[PDB]
Each structure stands twice: as structure tokens, then as C-alpha cells.
Curated annotation (Swiss-Prot), chain A:
The gene is EIF2B2. This is Translation initiation factor eIF2B subunit beta. It comes from Homo sapiens (Human). Activated by the chemical integrated stress response (ISR) inhibitor ISRIB which stimulates guanine nucleotide exchange factor activity for both phosphorylated and unphosphorylated eIF2. Keywords: Cytoplasm, Disease variant, Initiation factor, Leukodystrophy, Protein biosynthesis. PANTHER family: TRANSLATION INITIATION FACTOR EIF-2B SUBUNIT BETA.
From Swiss-Prot, chain B:
Component of the translation initiation factor 2B (eIF2B) complex which is a heterodecamer of two sets of five different subunits: alpha, beta, gamma, delta and epsilon. Subunits alpha, beta and delta comprise a regulatory subcomplex and subunits epsilon and gamma comprise a catalytic subcomplex. Within the complex, the hexameric regulatory complex resides at the center, with the two heterodimeric catalytic subcomplexes bound on opposite sides. Signal peptide: none annotated. Residues 5-14 are annotated as: May bind the chemical integrated stress response (ISR) inhibitor ISRIB. It is linked to Leukoencephalopathy with vanishing white matter 4: An autosomal recessive brain disease characterized by neurological features including progressive cerebellar ataxia, spasticity, and cognitive deficits. Brain imaging shows abnormal white matter that vanishes over time and is replaced by cerebrospinal fluid. Disease severity ranges from fatal infantile forms to adult forms without neurological deterioration. The disease is progressive with, in most individuals, additional episodes of rapid deterioration following febrile infections or minor head trauma. The keyword Cytoplasm applies. The gene is EIF2B4. This is Translation initiation factor eIF2B subunit delta. GO terms for molecular function: guanyl-nucleotide exchange factor activity; translation initiation factor activity; translation initiation factor binding. One of its GO terms (biological process) is T cell receptor signaling pathway. It comes from the Eukaryota. The keyword ATP-binding does not apply.
From Swiss-Prot, chain C:
Disulfide bonds: none annotated. It comes from Homo sapiens (Human). Its main location: cytoplasm. It is linked to Leukoencephalopathy with vanishing white matter 3: An autosomal recessive brain disease characterized by neurological features including progressive cerebellar ataxia, spasticity, and cognitive deficits. Brain imaging shows abnormal white matter that vanishes over time and is replaced by cerebrospinal fluid. Disease severity ranges from fatal infantile forms to adult forms without neurological deterioration. The disease is progressive with, in most individuals, additional episodes of rapid deterioration following febrile infections or minor head trauma. Gene3D superfamilies: Hexapeptide repeat proteins, Spore Coat Polysaccharide Biosynthesis Protein SpsA, Chain A. This is Translation initiation factor eIF2B subunit gamma. One of its GO terms (cellular component) is eukaryotic translation initiation factor 2B complex. It is found in: Cytoplasm, Cytosol. Component of the translation initiation factor 2B (eIF2B) complex which is a heterodecamer of two sets of five different subunits: alpha, beta, gamma, delta and epsilon. Subunits alpha, beta and delta comprise a regulatory subcomplex and subunits epsilon and gamma comprise a catalytic subcomplex. Within the complex, the hexameric regulatory complex resides at the center, with the two heterodimeric catalytic subcomplexes bound on opposite sides. The keyword Protein biosynthesis applies.
UniProtKB/Swiss-Prot annotation, chain D:
Activated by the chemical integrated stress response (ISR) inhibitor ISRIB which stimulates guanine nucleotide exchange factor activity for both phosphorylated and unphosphorylated eIF2. The modification Phosphoserine is found at S81, S394. GO terms for molecular function: guanyl-nucleotide exchange factor activity; translation initiation factor activity; translation initiation factor binding. There is a cross-link at K12, K54, K92, K168 (Glycyl lysine isopeptide (Lys-Gly) (interchain with G-Cter in ubiquitin)). Changing R64H: In VWM5; with ovarian failure. The keyword Acetylation applies. Phosphorylated on serine and threonine residues by GSK3B; phosphorylation inhibits its function. Polyubiquitinated, probably by NEDD4. The modification Phosphothreonine is found at T273. Keywords: Acetylation, Cytoplasm, Disease variant, Initiation factor, Isopeptide bond, Leukodystrophy, Methylation, Phosphoprotein, Protein biosynthesis, Ubl conjugation. The chain holds residues 40 to 450 of 721 of the full protein. This is Translation initiation factor eIF2B subunit epsilon. GO terms for cellular component: cytoplasm; cytosol; eukaryotic translation initiation factor 2B complex; nucleus.
Length: 308, 353, 347, 394
């Protein structure tokens, strides 16, 4: 039925399911359902329906790149499925089920490869809460006691919660304000950041302090990993400008109090930022450990030239 | 007396030399009330600092010069003393008392040493009123000379670059970078200032509501995401309070997180400081000379009040809130001093003269 | 010299039990020691030097009696006025005052620390600093130390009237309904010279015209939650539990705690002690009973008496198996063979 | 399911609840906010110049079986009184429980899923002691959304947040004055002047019955001034729940149209962004629109829309001002804080500043407008003329 419309409203109003493959489980859900029982013609009328419902879905807040990402991957499974087909619903829904089960284990396998990086007594450093970086760092509690420096930035700040969820289970964290990321980072090694979405050229679109942070990395020459799973490799190299973000209400940065000053003064609030591929020095991923400058072909491994 | 002490919490490893303090008033409980011979007057200001009621990196010099002007205008010159070594010894533990208020200060030392000079330079045979009124008179001529009648003069150089079309960017509160950027709207030359402010004790609002009553327009961004003003800036007049002879620029903790985040976009960076606030030390990094301050202020009441109060009851989760930073003079352009627009590397050349 | 301390002697407002020579000064103790002492050991506790007191010739007799650090009072108040409610209390000694001043005159005992309510003056360099305990409505802002309108029900009609301008700055005024006021005011040395000339103002609850800071001198005063209470009412017996002897004939046959008896006095037999203070030079001899009652000096009671919380004044006597229940036994009178009621035995 | 009914010069021809906010009509924002907090069926009570709203709200996306808050609009020719609106509601016997009334101008993003608990369980505890919840947002005065002709001096009790007294200082008293009855009883009295009325209510259905009896009551402030002095034998209480997030109004005067449609462009309602239901955002808040051709040497400086269909000319300097769909300004135009509408057309060499305009209007050469003037409804200024302040043409 048209419960997807509710879903089309659900992404419209906001209220995030915290990126935990819930957008992916949902997009797989609705694509499974529209894939299940709909109109049927042989010659990709299903694919045309995927383009229509696709572009209607992408008409949401243009930041949830996972929605269109798994949409396009469903299309590539359709194209290869027909490619071998040269009863298709059985093969398509089965392979989509296999992609679901493969998606069902990202946060474990991307966290197994952790002992091979962090060593004893090694002052790691991140910024901003992320599920994968916390799970990833929790499987390195069967090794020695390092430190963790976490930045408290990007207000409204969703960051501390992580400083709790770590320090009551693990290593000796300290929490620094965002405006002190250059007295620190003279005494550190091995920076990690989680990623909101990563671009085709090799860019990280992340939380609103990622840049200003990576610049310090390629100033003191410390390597920064951006641990990010699959299904977040977005096409469309950074052409569209200023729709790249989320501008939120300036209540979060200035209070509605202090009247009259708020007549003539301009307030800005960006949620994301731009990390170019000239500063990332490894990707830890779900299947391999690929470098920055290789990421290109990995994208060609997944998609098809209908990247629009 | 001078119990002082009362340090709290666990400092975050690394620097254990720096002494943390809590704003529970500390010292007020110990002191005697009839007069309490520690301080006739300086207990007033000394109480006034700790709560956060002066705190501007300038005008602490004005405060200490005022109170020392009164206490120097109260002295008694005992029957067996020369009053030079007597008073010059007498002022010691009182300045030590304010020194236990908050870590020392920033170059008010230079004032203190100057006072010690003028006290030591006193003639050995005069009237108590003669040398007394002479002393406080000179103590006035100083603050008229290097604090009053120089900041006006260090604005006339600044107009020469601030001309029409540019988009300047000051950072947080400032003492001179309001005068020499607000005596430039008067005398025309329209522009568009953008201010950027740091997450605790915000301090950027004092600018943004001390400038809209001049009429020059504005904008506002927190230091966490100052990567959007930088593709439209045309200067940054980031002024600060201590110049160290290795060309270091001791700013607030935010600065230097912007400067070497600016020169990767090719916009210049111009510092503005005064002529007494440059000191003869040398420091290489931030972790030898900071001053931590009350790590309880970090509490974002943003819904369920995620533990902020609860950290103490957690173990190994200490938060740190630094106060200064450092700017190395490879990322700093011209310094607009009160003796010309001298180059950064000649930071020592003003010293000998 | 930072401050100066004035502890004058106001006079006798309304206490019929004290109206006689019971109170020749406020030195009539419902506490253990006299009433000049228990306040006047705080100002000497916190460490002030030689203080200024002002009475009228009566505690001049008790001058050589008491003991303290230092004092230099004036007993020359010349009580033909029974007056000077901070008017000529300050103005009488005005060519002696040469600095700031804090005042607490012959008043209530206080159980709170001076450190806070002298810091909140010495910080902001304000004009006023008074205490509070927690109708005469006084409001305060959304912090401590911010005094809004303080106005009694006297000069008011059936409503309140907020001054407009002082509700557009400081724009959340919260009115404190009922606060037991206290007489610990701290003032600056100019607001003395204001009432030095223009002396038509008087009556220290009418020197609160600095609750008109609008239209810059500011005022600040802080609340508490503790046991500093007022002791100038007929409720002196309510403050009789102080809980801050040895040289007496203590029988200890009665085994009783949480009470006190004065020295050079004989305890009794066949008796008990239930939360009652007892004066010095008081004979207890044969079956008696303490009562949660107050006992002055120079009296004797014995012989099957059993009282219940009365006010045993000085120069009294009881015998013959007495029984009272909350009476105000007068001074200079005595009753033995009676079973009276809660009424007062007048002079 | 909360029903939450919504009641209903330039306002002569067109209604005051279908005038456009910024390319959207004010009877769609209320449909939004009430569709955001949650409402299953909403009731529109039509007042004056009616039956057009019965087409516009029949034309929008709300009129669809795909919708959630399935509306049912009512029209009343007899109820032209703007008071006792609920008299035909209880008389018609419509609601079941917990109304949430808001009349007309409602541009708000406040969620009402947190207050309804506070007067749900609380209402249950006194089982009959609380009447309604009057939501009111925090502000500081000297903010230019609080007009001269609006304020409050509502003085609530601490620790229970019950509205004891009331005022409406629109008469601008030189000294406001609460009554001694409130300060008489003694728990703790706080008299807050900060608040600014958001005119949204969540009233128990019993407040319908309290309108049936005592039929001499009309205004909301008339009602609240009623039930807090009289009805001394246990009437009710008035309990309010403040906010610090997004706000809505509700600003009727043109002076309130100035502010509350110049902060809906500056993004102060973060899910009620102009990109709603075409545009594209940009730097320094120039939220341009599709099918739009600017001219050479134009400078669209700061905080300005440009609707679907316009064409400005060379040497334009449009700044801090909206511009509707379909217009065409000319060469060397100068807009500044103005607000055109659907189908206006100014001509060359203008000096339009701090003014308004209206639909299907025009202007010709040398017409140099001035502060606060408002042309209306197909008027034309024409030849060389310089209208003074307040020159309300017709």
C-alpha cells in the first residue's frame, strides 16, 4: 500500500533512526514490497517504477544518502539479474535477501580488524559520536590501556554521550572543547573520525568540525583513518553546491533571548562540512582495507552508469 | 595566614604542575573581617576576580594599578625604616595573595616589576607626602602614557588597511580590536564584520552587542565551524594580549585553531597588540604555561542533561578546559604595534629600544 | 580599618513580663548568659576589635560585669526620648564614626556565619547588606542579592503597584511573601552622611529608601535556611532552648540531661529534670519536679511541687506542693499553697 | 484523537486568513502545525467573506484521501460574532475530549506532544481542578516581535505553574498593578513579564460547558479575566507550560506581519523552511527560485526570495525583501525591505523602501515611495510622484 507515503513523510519531518541500517532496513523494506507485488511488465517497467519511486524518495531531505545509495544498488542487482536472465522475481528477491543478510553484519566484521591497528599506550583521538567507531574501539579493550581524546564540538553537540558510553567500560577518556584542538594534536597519534557519507572522488562529508581537524593531521603528519562501512559510497562528485548540508534553526547557536541584537545580525548554522581526499590516509571498510586513491574503482564495483 | 590551596578534582595527567581551582569562593571563608591585615583593599578585587567579574586581559592592569594606587596612598613609613625596602618588601605577600587568586595574570607582571622599579628608585630624603604623592602621580602617568594615550594612536595606523570593500573577522571579545575597528566606521569606509565565538564563556556576544550600536553590520558563527567565513574573508584582525620574544602570540584558547586554519585558504592574518603587553620569556608549546579553570562549566542542558554532574562519580573521565594557546610566527603576518607596523620576527627589536 | 561595628541599645518595645525591673537593660536572659553576650560574641568571634555600644546608664552598671575583647560604649544616651531608631543612634556618635559601619543593636541572637553576608557586600561595593530568615511584602530577582520593591502592608491599599521600569529591566521579579526580618544591616559610609544632615528621616525600617533605586547606588541582601531567629518578642521562651553548671551542690539523685542549672545552687532529692534551664543561687531541697520551664536567679522551690513549663522570675519562691501549667510567674512575688492556671501573676 | 478545531482595508476584498505569508497562505501553516503535533480530524469554522476558503482548502493537498488530519469545515452565517464559537460546538455536540484551539494566524513549529502529558496526568490528579493549558513562549522585551499593543504581566505560582493573576498591558500603564489577594496567600509568588503569547490552547471539553452558562463572555482574555476572580467556589485553575524551542504566531497587525514573515525567510522555523510544500538555497540566504532570469549587473544581496516567474533588470539592488511569483521589475529598480505579491510590476528608477504592495498592481516612472506606505488591490501610482509616509492608496 501507500504506507511509503508515510515513510515519505517520515523522512520529511526528520527524527533520525540513528543511521544504524534502519534507513537501509526500511529502504530494503519498501523496495522489497514494491518489488513484491506491483504492476508487471517484462521490459523494466519495474525498473521504471524504481526510477519513479526512487526520485520521489530522493525528494526527501537531501542528506540521507543511504536511501538513494541502497536504491541504486537495488537497481544494479536488477541490471545484473536481467543480464544473467538473457521467474525473475524469485532471483531478484532472493538476491535482495542476500544483500540484506550481508548488510546484517557490518558493525562486527568492520570491528574485528581492530587489534591490528591500535597498540599499547597510544593516544588515539576522535570527534563526534558514531556507532561504528564506538563498537570498533570497544573490541580493542582486550589490549592495553591507551587514552582517548574526544572533542566536544558541533553544538548542538551529540558528542558526550559517547564519552559516557566509553569511559564507564574502557580507557581513560578526556573531553576537550572544540576550540582547543591545536594545543592538543601536538601530543597525539592515530586520529579516527566516523563518516556521515563519503563521495566519489574520495571525500568525507561529516560532522561540522571534521575540517579544521584534518588540517591539523596533515600539519603534524599523523595518519587519520575514517572507518566507514560499505553502502555509503556515494556517486555524484561534489558538483551540487550548498545543498550539501543541513542548515538548522539558529536557536541552537543563539538563544531567542537578548532582544534587538537579533534584529540586524546574521546567524549561520551548518551541520556538515567538507573533507577533501587530499588528507585521508586509509579507509577501514567492510571487506578490505583499501587506500584513498583506489576508492574510485570500488564504486564501479557496485553501481552502473545510471548514477543520476 | 594565606592558607590558599583548596584544589579540586583530578587534573588530566600530562600537566600536573598547573594548579586547578574551583569557584566555591575558596579564600573568603578563611579571612578575618575587622581588617584582616592581608589586604586593606586588595581583598576586594581579589574577591572580584575569582567569581569572574573583571576578566578582560586588559584593565586588570587598570584594576591592580588602581588598588595599588590607594594602598600606596595609605602607607605609614615606620620609625625604623627607609620606606623603600620597607614598602617594597611590604607589597610582596599581597601580590602573592592575588597570585593565589588565579594563575598570575598576563603581563601585569610587567606592571608589577615597573612598580618595583619606581618604588626602588625613591629618593632617600624627602617628605612622606612628597614621595608618596610623587609615587602615585607617576603611577598615574604610566597608565595615561602606555594604556590610555597609545591605544588611540594605534588606531591611526589601522585605518590605512581597513578600507572599503573588505570583510574583516575579529574573534571573541577584545579590548583594542573594538576601538580600532569602530573608529573606522566614523570616517566612512563601509565594510561587513563577521564575529566568531568559542563554546564556553561565549564572550563573542560582548562584541556583537557592542557593535550593533555603532551601525556596522554583522554576522555570527561559532569557532567549531569557521570554515565558511574563510572562503569570503579578506583579513582577520585577531588581536591578543601577550607577545613572547620567540614571536609567539598568546591568545585565547581558540586562536591558532583559526590562523593555521586560514592560511590554507590564502587570507592573511594580522595581529594587533600594545607596547607593554609583550614579555621577555620564551615558550615553545601550550603545555608549560596554560591556566586551567573550573571544569564544571561544561554542562550542555540540551534535553535530559546527559551527565555533566555525574562525571565526578564516574572514574577516569576527567574533562579539561584550557585558557591560553600559542601562535608560532610562521603563521603570523604584520603586528600593528604602537611604534609602527613592525614585522613579527622583530618581536625582540622592540625590547632593546 | 575596613568596617566599624555599632551595637546600640534600642529600648523596650512591648514585653510586660520584662516591663518591670525584670529588664533594666536587654540583659534579661531567656538564654543562659545575658542577651548582650550571645550576639556580642559573634562580632568578637569573627575577630573585630574595640566596638561601639550605646545604652543609657543601666548596662553602665553591667559594664564592669561582663567580659569581652574590648569595648568603649557611651552610656550617655539620656533617655528623655526613648527614641533614635538609627537616627541619633548613628547621629549621636557621628563625630566619632570615621569609616564604614555595620550595625546590630541589642537585638536577636544569630546562628549564621558573617562571612557570606560580608562577602556579598565587599565584592560589589554596594550600598546595603541585610539578612533574612524565611505581612510586609519584599520581592527579589532570579538570583540572590537582587532587591526589588520592599514595601509593608501599611502604606499599601488593597493591591500592589510595580514601578514598570524595574519590570522591564531584571524581567522576572519573584516576591518573597513572609520573611522574618533581621537586624544585621551593613551600609556604606556615605549613606551615613546622607542622614547626618536632613535628619527628618528616622526609624531604621524607614531608612529603606534605597529600595528606590530606579529613575547608581544598589542594594543586595541574602536569605538562608538555619537557626538565626528573632528574640525581641514575648516568644523569648521559644528561644530559651539555646544548646550552645559545675560549681554548685549537684545532688545528681535526679539523673537528667539536656538541661542546665546555674552555679552555687543546691540540687534536690526525689526529683527529675525534663528539658528545663535553671538559674544560679537556686535551692532545690525536697521532692521537686523540673518542667521544661525557665528559672531565674534568687528563688527556691521544693516540697512536692510539680510544674509544667512556666516562667519562674527572679525574687520568687515556691513550696507547699505547687502545680502550674504555662504561667508567667511575676518577679518579687511568691506562691506556695496554690493550684493556679495558665494566667500571669502580676506584680 | 485530538480534534483541535481552528476558527477564522486590504482585508476588505480578501480574507485575513488567506493572505499570503511568503508564497503560502496562512490557512496552510495552521494545517501544518496541527498536522505536526498530531490531529486526526480538524474543524474549520468559517466567519467572513467565506466560501473561498471552502475552495482553497478544498484545492490543497489536505483535501485528499491520502491525508491524515481529515478535515471537516463548518460555515456559520449566524455566528458572525467571533465569540462563543464553541457554543455551536457543544450545541452541535462535536468534540469528545481535550480540544486544542487556535484561531487563524498560526505559523508555528512547536510540538504539543509533551505538554499534553503535563495537563493529562495533572488534569487527572485534581480530577476536575484544571481547565486548560495556555502555551506561552519565552522572550525578552525590546524584541521586535512583541508589539506595542501586546504584552502580559501574568504572575504564576512557583512549583505548580498555575496562572493566578492576569493583565493585558496594551493600554501601556506607567505602573502595572497586581492585586493583593494573590500575594495574600503564601507559598511563593513570581511575577514574570518575559512571556509572549503564542495564542495556542489545549482546553478540556468542560470549557465548552463553561461557555454555555455565563453567556456574556466573548474574548479569550475576557474568559480568563472571568474565571480567576469570580467562581470562587472551586471553579478551576489555569496551568501554563513554557517553551524554549520553535515558536508560532498569530501576529495580526501589519507591524506583526513585518516581523513574522521576515523570520520565516531567515530559517527560524527549521522544518518550516521555504523549501516546502520550489527553490534552492544559497550563500547569505538568497533563496532563489526556478524559472527566473536576473539581469546583468544585478546584486541580489542578502535575505531575499525570488518567486517562480519573475524577471528583474540591469543595475538592480534587491535586498532584505521578498518578491512574489510572476512579477517583473525594471532597469535600475531599488527594492529595500519591501514585499511585493503575485503579479505586481514596478518600473524604472524606483526608490521603493520599507513598504508593501499587493496583487495585480503596477507603478510607472519616477514613483519614489517612502516608509510604511501600502498600495493595494490593482491600484497604480503612475506618473512622477513622491508619496509621503503612510500613504495608503486604494
Amino acid at each position: 500500500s501507500e504506507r511509503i507515503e508515510s515513510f515519505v513523510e517520515t523522512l520529511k519531518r526528520g527524527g533520525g533512526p540513528r543511521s544504524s541500517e534502519e534507513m537501509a532496513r526500511e529502504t530494503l523494506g519498501l523496495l522489497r514490497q514494491i518489488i513484491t507485488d506491483h504492476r508487471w511488465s517484462n521490459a523494466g517497467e519495474l525498473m521504471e517504477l524504481i526510477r519513479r519511486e526512487g526520485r520521489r524518495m530522493t525528494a526527501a531531505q537531501p542528506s540521507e544518502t543511504t536511501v538513494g545509495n541502497m536504491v541504486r544498488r537495488v537497481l544494479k542487482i536488477i541490471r545484473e539479474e536481467y543480464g544473467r536472465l538473457h521467474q525473475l522475481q524469485s532471483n531478484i528477491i532472493e538476491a535482495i535477501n542476500e544483500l540484506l543478510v550481508e548488510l546484517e553484519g557490518t558493525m562486527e566484521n568492520i570491528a574485528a580488524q581492530a587489534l591490528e591497528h591500535i597498540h599499547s599506550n597510544e593516544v588515539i583521538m576522535t570527534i563526534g559520536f558514531s556507532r561504528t567507531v564506538e563498537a570498533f574501539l570497544k573490541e580493542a579493550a582486550r589490549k592495553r590501556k591507551f587514552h582517548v581524546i574526544v572533542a566536544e564540538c558541533a553544538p548542538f553537540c551529540q558528542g558526550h554521550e559517547m564519552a559516557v558510553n566509553l569511559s564507564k567500560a574502557g580507557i581513560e577518556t578526556t573531553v576537550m572543547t572544540d576550540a582547543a584542538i591545536f594545543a592538543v594534536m601536538s601530543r597525539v597519534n592515530k586520529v579516527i573520525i566516523g563518516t556521515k557519507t563519503i563521495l566519489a572522488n574520495g571525500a568525507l562529508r561529516a560532522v561540522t568540525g571534521t575540517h579544521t581537524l584534518a588540517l591539523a593531521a596533515k600539519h603534524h603528519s599523523t595518519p587519520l583513518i575514517v572507518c566507514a562501512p560499505m553502502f555509503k559510497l556515494s556517486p555524484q562528485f561534489p558538483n551540487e553546491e550548498d545543498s550539501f548540508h543541513k542548515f538548522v534553526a539558529p536557536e541552537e547557536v543563539l538563544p531567542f533571548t537578548e532582544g534587538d541584537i537579533l534584529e540586524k545580525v546574521s546567524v549561520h548554522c551548518p551541520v556538515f562540512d567538507y573533507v577533501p581526499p587530499e588528507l585521508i590516509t586509509l579507509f577501514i571498510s567492510n571487506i578490505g582495507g583499501n587506500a584513498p586513491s583506489y576508492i574510485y574503482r570500488l564504486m564501479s564495483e557496485l553501481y552502473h552508469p545510471d548514477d543520476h | 595566614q594565606v592558607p590558599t590551596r583548596k584544589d579540586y578534582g583530578s587534573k588530566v595527567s600530562l600537566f600536573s604542575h598547573l594548579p586547578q581551582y574551583s569557584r566555591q569562593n575558596s579564600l573568603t571563608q578563611f579571612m578575618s573581617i575587622p581588617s584582616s591585615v592581608i589586604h586593606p583593599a586588595m581583598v576586594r578585587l581579589g574577591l572580584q576576580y575569582s567569581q569572574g567579574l573583571v576578566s578582560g586581559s586588559n584593565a586588570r592592569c587598570i584594576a591592580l594599578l588602581r588598588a595599588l594606587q590607594q594602598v600606596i596612598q595609605d602607607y605609614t613609613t615606620p620609625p625604623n625604616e627607609e620606606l623603600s625596602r620597607d614598602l617594597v618588601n611590604k607589597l610582596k605577600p599581597y601580590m602573592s595573595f592575588l597570585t593565589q587568586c588565579r594563575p598570575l595574570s598576563a603581563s601585569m607582571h610587567n606592571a608589577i616589576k615597573f612598580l618595583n622599579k619606581e618604588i626602588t628608585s625613591v629618593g632617600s630624603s624627602k617628605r612622606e607626602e612628597e614621595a608618596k604623592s610623587e609615587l602615585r602621580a607617576a603611577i598615574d602617568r604610566y597608565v595615561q602614557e602606555k594604556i590610555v594615550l597609545a591605544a588611540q594612536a594605534i588606531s591611526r595606523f589601522a585605518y590605512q588597511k581597513i578600507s572599503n570593500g573588505d570583510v574583516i573577522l575579529v574573534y571573541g571579545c577584545s579590548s583594542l580590536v573594538s576601538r580600532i575597528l569602530q573608529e573606522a566606521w566614523t570616517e566612512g569606509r563601509r565594510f561587513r564584520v563577521v564575529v566568531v565565538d568559542s563554546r564556553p564563556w561565549l564572550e563573542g556576544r560582548h562584541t556583537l552587542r557592542s557593535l550593533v550600536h555603532a551601525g556596522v553590520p554583522a554576522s555570527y558563527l561559532l569557532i567549531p565551524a569557521a570554515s565558511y567565513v574563510l572562503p569570503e574573508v579578506s583579513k582577520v584582525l585577531l588581536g591578543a594580549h601577550a607577545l613572547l620574544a620567540n614571536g609567539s602570540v598568546m591568545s585565547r584558547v581558540g586562536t591558532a585553531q583559526l590562523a593555521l586554519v586560514a592560511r590554507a585558504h590564502n587570507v592573511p592574518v594580522l595581529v594587533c597588540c600594545e607596547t607593554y603587553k609583550f614579555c621577555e620569556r620564551v615558550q615553545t608549546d601550550a603545555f608549560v604555561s596554560n591556566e586551567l579553570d573550573d571544569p564544571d562549566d561544561l554542562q550542555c542542558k540540551r534535553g535530559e542533561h546527559v551527565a555533566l554532574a555525574n562525571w565526578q562519580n564516574h572514574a577516569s573521565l576527567r574533562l579539561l578546559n584550557l585558557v591560553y594557546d600559542v601562535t608560532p610566527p610562521e603563521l603570523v603576518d604584520l603586528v600593528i604595534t604602537e611604534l609602527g607596523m613592525i614585522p613579527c620576527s622583530s618581536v625582540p627589536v622592540v625590547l632593546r629600544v | 580599618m575596613e568596617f566599624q561595628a555599632v551595637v546600640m541599645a534600642v529600648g523596650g518595645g512591648s514585653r510586660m513580663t520584662d516591663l518591670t525591673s525584670s529588664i533594666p537593660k536587654p540583659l534579661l536572659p531567656v538564654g543562659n548568659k545575658p542577651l548582650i553576650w550571645y550576639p556580642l560574641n559573634l562580632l568578637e568571634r569573627v575577630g573585630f576589635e574595640e566596638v561601639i555600644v550605646v545604652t543609657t546608664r543601666d548596662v553602665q552598671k553591667a559594664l564592669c560585669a561582663e567580659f569581652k575583647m574590648k569595648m568603649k560604649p557611651d552610656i550617655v544616651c539620656i533617655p528623655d526620648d526613648a527614641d533614635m531608631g538609627t537616627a541619633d543612634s548613628l547621629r549621636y556618635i557621628y563625630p566619632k564614626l570615621k569609616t564604614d559601619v555595620l550595625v546590630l543593636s541589642c537585638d536577636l541572637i544569630t546562628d549564621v556565619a558573617l562571612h557570606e553576608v560580608v562577602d556579598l557586600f565587599r565584592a560589589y561595593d554596594a550600598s546595603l547588606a541585610m539578612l533574612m530568615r524565611k505581612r510586609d511584602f519584599i520581592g527579589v530577582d532570579s538570583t540572590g542579592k537582587r532587591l526589588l520593591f520592599m514595601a509593608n502592608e501599611a502604606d499599601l491599599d488593597e493591591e500592589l503597584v510595580i514601578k514598570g521600569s524595574i519590570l522591564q529591566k531584571h524581567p522576572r521579579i519573584r516576591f518573597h511573601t513572609g520573611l522574618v526580618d533581621a537586624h544585621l544591616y551593613c551600609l556604606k559610609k556615605y549613606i551615613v552622611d546622607f542622614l547626618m544632615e536632613n535628619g527628618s528621616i528616622t526609624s531604621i525600617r524607614s531608612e529603606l529608601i534605597p529600595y528606590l533605586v530606579r529613575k547608581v547606588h544598589i542594594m543586595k541582601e541574602g536569605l538562608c535556611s538555619r537557626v538565626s531567629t528573632l528574640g525581641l518578642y514575648m516568644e523569648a521562651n521559644r528561644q530559651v532552648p539555646k544548646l550552645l553548671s559545675s560549681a554548685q551542690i549537684v545532688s545528681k539523685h535526679l539523673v537528667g540531661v539536656d538541661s542546665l542549672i546555674g552555679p552555687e545552687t543546691q540540687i534536690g532529692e526525689k526529683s527529675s529534670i525534663k528539658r528545663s534551664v535553671i538559674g544560679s543561687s537556686c535551692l532545690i531541697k525536697d521532692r521537686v519536679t523540673i518542667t521544661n520551664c525557665l528559672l531565674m536567679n534568687s528563688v527556691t522551690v521544693e516540697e512536692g511541687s510539680n510544674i509544667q513549663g512556666s516562667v519562674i522570675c527572679n525574687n520568687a519562691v515556691i513550696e507547699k506542693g505547687a502545680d502550674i501549667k504555662d504561667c508567667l510567674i511575676g518577679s518579687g512575688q511568691r506562691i506556695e499553697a496554690k493550684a493556679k492556671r495558665v494566667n500571669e501573676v502580676i506584680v | 484523537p485530538p480534534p483541535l478545531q481552528a476558527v477564522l482595508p486590504i482585508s476588505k476584498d480578501q480574507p485575513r486568513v488567506l493572505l499570503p505569508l511568503a508564497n503560502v497562505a496562512l490557512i496552510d501553516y495552521t494545517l501544518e502545525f496541527l498536522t505536526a503535533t498530531g490531529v486526526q480530524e480538524t474543524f474549520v469554522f468559517c466567519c467572513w467573506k467565506a466560501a473561498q476558503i471552502k475552495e482553497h482548502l478544498l484545492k490543497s493537498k489536505w483535501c485528499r484521501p491520502t491525508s491524515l488530519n481529515v478535515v471537516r469545515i463548518i460555515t456559520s452565517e449566524l455566528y458572525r460574532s467571533l465569540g462563543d464559537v464553541l457554543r455551536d460546538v457543544d450545541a452541535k455536540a462535536l468534540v469528545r475530549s481535550d480540544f486544542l484551539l487556535v484561531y487563524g494566524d498560526v505559523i508555528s513549529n512547536i510540538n504539543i506532544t509533551r505538554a499534553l502529558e503535563e495537563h493529562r496526568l495533572r488534569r487527572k490528579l485534581e480530577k476536575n481542578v484544571s481547565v486548560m493549558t495556555m502555551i506561552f513562549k519565552e522572550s525578552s522585551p525590546s524584541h521586535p516581535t512583541r508589539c506595542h499593543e501586546d504584552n502580559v504581566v501574568v504572575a504564576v505560582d512557583s512549583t505548580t505553574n498555575r496562572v493566578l493573576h492576569f493583565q493585558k498591558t496594551q493600554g501601556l500603564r506607567r505602573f502595572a498593578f497586581p492585586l493583593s489577594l494573590f500575594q495574600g496567600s503564601s507559598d511563593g509568588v513570581e511575577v514574570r513579564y518575559d512571556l509572549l503569547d503564542c495564542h495556542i490552547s489545549i482546553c478540556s471539553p468542560q470549557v465548552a460547558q463553561l461557555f454555555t452558562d455565563n453567556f456574556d463572555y466573548q474574548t479569550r482574555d475576557d474568559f480568563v479575566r472571568g474565571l480567576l476572580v469570580n467562581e470562587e467556589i472551586l471553579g478551576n485553575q489555569i496551568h501554563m507550560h513554557v517553551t524554549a524551542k520553535e515558536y508560532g504566531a498569530r501576529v495580526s497587525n501589519l507591524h506583526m506581519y513585518s516581523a513574522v514573515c521576515a523570520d520565516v525567510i531567515r530559517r527560524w522555523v527549521y522544518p518550516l523552511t521555504p523549501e516546502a510544500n520550489s527553490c534552492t538555497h544559497s550563500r547569505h540566504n538568497i533563496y532563489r527560485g526556478p524559472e527566473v532570469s536576473l539581469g546583468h549587473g544585478s546584486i541580489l544581496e542578502e535575505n531575499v526570495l525570488l518567486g517562480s516567474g519573475t524577471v528583474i533588470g540591469s543595475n538592480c539592488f534587491i535586498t532584505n525583501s521578498v518578491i512574489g511569483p510572476g512579477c517583473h521589475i525594471g532597469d535600475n529598480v531599488v527594492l529595500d525591505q519591501t514585499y511585493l505579491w503575485q503579479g505586481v510590476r514596478v518600473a524604472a528608477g524606483a526608490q521603493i523602501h520599507q513598504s508593501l504592495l499587493c496583487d495585480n498592481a503596477e507603478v510607472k516612472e519616477r514613483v519614489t515611495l517612502k516608509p510604511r506606505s501600502v498600495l493595494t488591490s490593482q491600484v497604480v501610482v503612475g506618473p512622477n510622484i513622491t508619496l509621503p509616509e503612510g500613504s495608503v492608496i486604494s
